[PDB]
């Protein structure tokens with residue numbers, strides 16, 4: 385992996401692994417999301433982070449995901465080389481955005497694109513806050529100044545408001561718990577695990593006859609290591625659309641809400 | 650990755666990923682086991698198994714894991730390059746063995762080693778079988794003829810008999826279920842998931858103050874996509890544990906194992 389010529393974006397190539405593919409012998413959406421996370425981390429390392437800046441570590445502040453949106457046109461086959469380009473952009477005092485473009489290394493064609501919204505949070509109190517001027521100046525030297533968006537369209541799916549699923553759900557997967565492989569180096573549940581949990585309530589027949597085209601996921605609250613989650617899905621629709629909800633099994637506290645779009649194979 | 654000069658073994662380099670490491674910022678044993686599985690698949694592809702042979706496909710036969718044994722001296726740090734060398738060997742009519750050596754790419758030192766025993770099984774009836782002469786002949790052209798073992802020591806840990814844990818267990822993690830990420834391309838539970846499930850019943854204080862040195866795992870029966878598993882552990886002692894995975898309902902054994910941990 386390496387920063388591009390202008391140093392305002394980062395590229396990395398990955399060879400799709402045998403354990404990373406599903407029944408179609410192509411990468412799962414969770415493998416894609418793990419690769420996006422990996423190239424994001426390698427971008428942050430290449431410009432001097434550890435994604436906390438000097439001022440963020442001084443004030444016990446971190447970046448947390450608020451939303452992840454992914455659109456896949458072609459999932460890379462086992463043994464294929466996929467090239468991912470990533471960049472960051474400041475969105476004023478609201479937060480930051482990380483975008484990705486996925487390409488087939490052999491053809492050079494765009495096979496996927498993703499965008500994520502990040503908010504500032506105090507590590508200890510867990511209180512969200514706006515971005516300060518000092519933090520904005522610190523990361524503007526690593527971001528393109530003119531807008532560069534993976535989803536530029538006028539009324540694009542990445543910015544749509546997602547409603548709350550009403551009980552009873554059409555489908556459900558109950559009692560989901562994270563194991564040690566689901567945790568990151570800081571012992572927090574990996575963001576990709578939540579995508580897997582959302583997909584658990586999609587019926588097997590949809591997975592067997594459809595390919596996932598779009599997934600938009602809102603992150604409201606974290607799942608702790610000893611928490612238990614319920615995954616809920618309701619069909620909202622050639623294409624199939626679903627409305628999703630992750631909540632704690634006990635009190636029913638919302639942790640995530642989302643939507644998926646699937647196309648018939 | 651590539652086959653070595655003599656074509657009797659295969660080497661591949663891997664850069665340890667951010668999501669592949671634990672709290673110590675080094676690779677987890679599950680990341681290591683996934684890498685061993687990946688280099689094993691790439692070895693099989695390089696010698697034309699695109700690991701069923703021509704005779705095995707005609708006879709509806711497959712190789713299934715009976716035992717996995719792994720010993721780690723140093724877990725590679727995040728960003729490090731680890732080089733893994735793998736080879737296969739026929740063990741007469743019993744089955745086959747796949748061995749691995751893990752090295753630090755920078756120093757060239759051995760940081761780990763692993764060995765696995767594979768048995769022949771009919772994919773439909775699930776009945777274990779001895780290896781036929783035609784299959785053994787087809788495998789011998791890709792395996793070293795003289796013995797080459799990752800664990801050569803006479804009377805070593807990789808071949809020890811493992812006893813069955815007696816109830817009550819000291820520790821337990823109940824109601825474990827596989828999700829779609831736990832399945833392979835054939836919709837069967839990945840062998841590495843069982844290692845994670847065994848480790849779930851180890852208390853957090855052991856994980857926080859010790860590093861896993863050795864894991865020996867016996868595979869008795871498969872966990873189906875809709876099965877639920879209970880993970881049981883009892884201290885037998887360095888810290889040593891005896892492990893058991895069984896179905897939550899009838900208590901049918903799926904795995905048994907042992908782990909050895911060193912104080913950090």
Ligand SMILES: O=c1[nH]cnc2c1oc1ccccc12
Nearest residue numbers: 448449506507508570572606
């Ligand atoms: O270390 C953390 N403190 C507080 N909140 C979080 C921390 O790591 C996270 C990872 C994902 C989401 C929230 C958090």
Ligand SMILES: O=c1[nH]cnc2c1oc1ccccc12
Nearest residue numbers: 713771772773775835837871
């Ligand atoms: O296709 C299979 N049939 C029967 N037993 C197994 C099959 O795939 C497996 C993968 C791992 C372990 C057992 C099996």
